[PDB]
């Protein structure tokens, strides 16, 4: 019952300033960040936005190197140093240790040190193989090196436990320790080798393999003895319905931070691109595809409706009177068009049968429309926030339709978004030399961004 400061993090001017659509754009370029739970921070971007120590930061900018934070990263840190549970649901290499290892430190050195009397520790790392452990600990140990008010011991089945057991005799603020490991040494010595009464932070590591290998019933009972106001962290790379019931049950008010889980496109839509050289090339494309639609309408018959999007008001005047002169009729919105005329357009849209509506990208924010069988995008977006809005026209359920981008070939950003938007398998279902110019030009992106 001695209180305990779980509270610690103060959010930078730069992040503080950031608006919540610039989050929201952050957060899809971020591999997919997806929240939930009340409460929760932005994100920050960079070491220094996270009141760091001096040594914490000449190691991970000096040492290690790290240019720039993955995005459980970006979104666990902030969220973890606020004092929330935190669920961390994100692929094997993305940085997990890091994401909780951080805050841990934090906490445990704000702490009152272990008096005579005190055995320790005051985090507790659990996680499921020898080996893993092994590996926390060495994570633990280099960004604890420098500093004597923080020891680590790593408590496993680990040949010679009685290694272990001598050095937990001195008392020690972290222990890594697989889960059986855990509870035989709360029972060695009398209980008095290792107690619980001081741990206020908890992580669980690798959390489903965790359960996988039988160790639900160890960590339950760990989780019943220390105090109910222990601060808890779960990070893992998937997150079956037997881990979420534990960790509703387990933790306070928690939040949920999931790494590119689902598509930030509904996984119903189709979507696919073409490369053009030129304006006149993509034109070329509009108009072929347009007659495909056509061709598949004739082969049906033995209400299927399109939108495309265009960048401007001359843009889309002009393709206009040229899809007209291909004999192609379309209604056309943008601003240029009084509220009358826009309005006799969508009705026009809505009423005929398999039209095409073209439409200004920012005209179809507040666009009355109902979703569509296909959408072209004649000009290309450069934003996730865009793209996710533009392809969401056709996203309806099981019956979502196809979601075509008629893309430049120096249009790198647009590549980009691709790139990360597209499903894997569409991905991999791309011919190889479609996938090798998309990843060339994302790659180009990607370099001359940070560069
Ligand atoms: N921001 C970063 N930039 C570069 N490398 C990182 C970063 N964060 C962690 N790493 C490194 O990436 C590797 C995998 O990190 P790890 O925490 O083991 O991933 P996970 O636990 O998600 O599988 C480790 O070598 C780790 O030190
Ligand atoms: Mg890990």
């Known amino acids: 019952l001695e209180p305990f400061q779980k509270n610690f993090y103060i959010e930078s001017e730069t992040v503080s300033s950031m608006s919540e659509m610039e989050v929201e754009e952050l957060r899809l370029s971020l591999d997919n960040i997806k929240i939930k739970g009340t409460g929760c921070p932005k994100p920050v971007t960079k070491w220094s936005q996270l009141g760091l120590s001096t040594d914490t930061?000449?190691?991970?900018?000096?040492?290690?190197?790290?240019?720039?934070?993955?995005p459980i990263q970006s979104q666990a840190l902030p969220a973890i140093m606020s004092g929330r549970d935190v669920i961390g649901i994100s692929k094997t290499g993305s940085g997990?240790?890091?994401?909780?290892?951080?805050?841990?430190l934090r906490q445990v050195k704000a702490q009152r040190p272990l008096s005579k009397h005190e055995t320790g520790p005051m985090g507790l790392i659990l996680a499921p193989t020898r080996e893993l452990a092994l590996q926390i600990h060495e994570e633990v140990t280099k960004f604890t090196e420098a500093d004597?008010?923080?020891?680590?011991?790593?408590?496993?089945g680990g040949s010679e436990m009685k290694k272990q057991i001598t050095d937990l005799k001195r008392?020690?603020?972290?222990?890594?320790?697989?889960?059986?490991?855990?509870?035989?040494?709360?029972?060695?010595?009398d209980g008095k080798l290792l107690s619980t009464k001081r741990i206020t932070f908890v992580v669980m590591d690798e959390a489903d393999r965790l359960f996988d290998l039988g160790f639900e019933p160890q960590i339950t009972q760990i989780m019943k003895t220390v105090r109910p106001d222990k601060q808890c962290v779960l990070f893992?790379?998937?997150?079956?319905?037997?881990?979420?019931?534990?960790?509703?049950?387990?933790?306070?008010?928690?939040?949920?931070?999931?790494?590119?889980?689902?598509?930030?496109?509904?996984?119903?839509?189709?979507?696919?691109?073409?490369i053009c050289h030129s304006e006149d090339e993509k034109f070329d494309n509009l108009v072929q595809l347009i007659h495909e639609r056509s061709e598949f309408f004739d082969e049906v018959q033995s209400?299927?409706?399109?939108?495309?999007?265009?960048?401007?008001?001359?843009?889309?005047?002009?393709?206009?009177?040229?899809?007209?002169?291909?004999?192609?009729?379309?209604?056309?919105?943008?601003?240029?068009?009084?509220?009358?005329?826009?309005?006799?357009?969508?009705?026009?849209?809505?009423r005929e049968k398999n039209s095409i509506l073209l439409c200004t990208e920012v005209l179809s924010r507040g666009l009355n429309v109902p979703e569509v069988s296909l959408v072209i995008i004649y000009n290309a977006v450069?934003?996730?926030?865009?793209?996710?809005?533009?392809?969401?026209?056709?996203?309806?359920?099981?019956?979502?339709?196809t979601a075509i981008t008629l893309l430049?070939?120096?249009?790198?950003?647009?590549?980009?978004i691709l790139s990360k938007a597209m499903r894997d398998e569409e991905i991999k279902a791309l011919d190889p030399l479609q996938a090798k110019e998309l990843q060339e030009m994302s790659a180009k992106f990607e370099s001359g961004m940070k560069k």
Do not use: W
Not at 240 to 246: E, G, Q, T, V
């Open 57 to 70: 930061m000449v190691l991970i900018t000096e040492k290690l190197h790290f240019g720039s934070l993955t």
């Open 96 to 104: 997990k240790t890091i994401s909780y290892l951080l805050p841990l």
């Open 148 to 156: 004597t008010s923080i020891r680590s011991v790593c408590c496993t």
């Open 171 to 189: 008392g020690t603020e972290i222990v890594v320790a697989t889960p059986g490991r855990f509870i035989d040494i709360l029972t060695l010595n």
């Open 236 to 274: 893992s790379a998937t997150f079956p319905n037997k881990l979420r019931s534990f960790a509703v049950r387990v933790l306070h008010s928690p939040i949920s931070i999931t790494i590119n889980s689902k598509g930030m496109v509904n996984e119903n839509v189709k979507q696919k691109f073409r």
């Open 303 to 350: 209400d299927a409706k399109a939108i495309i999007f265009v960048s401007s008001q001359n843009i889309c005047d002009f393709i206009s009177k040229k899809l007209l002169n291909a004999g192609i009729v379309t209604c056309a919105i943008h601003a240029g068009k009084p509220y009358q005329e826009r309005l006799m357009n969508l009705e026009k849209f809505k």
């Open 382 to 401: 450069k934003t996730f926030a865009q793209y996710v809005h533009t392809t969401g026209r056709t996203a309806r359920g099981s019956r979502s339709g």
């Open 408 to 416: 430049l070939h120096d249009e790198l950003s647009g590549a980009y």
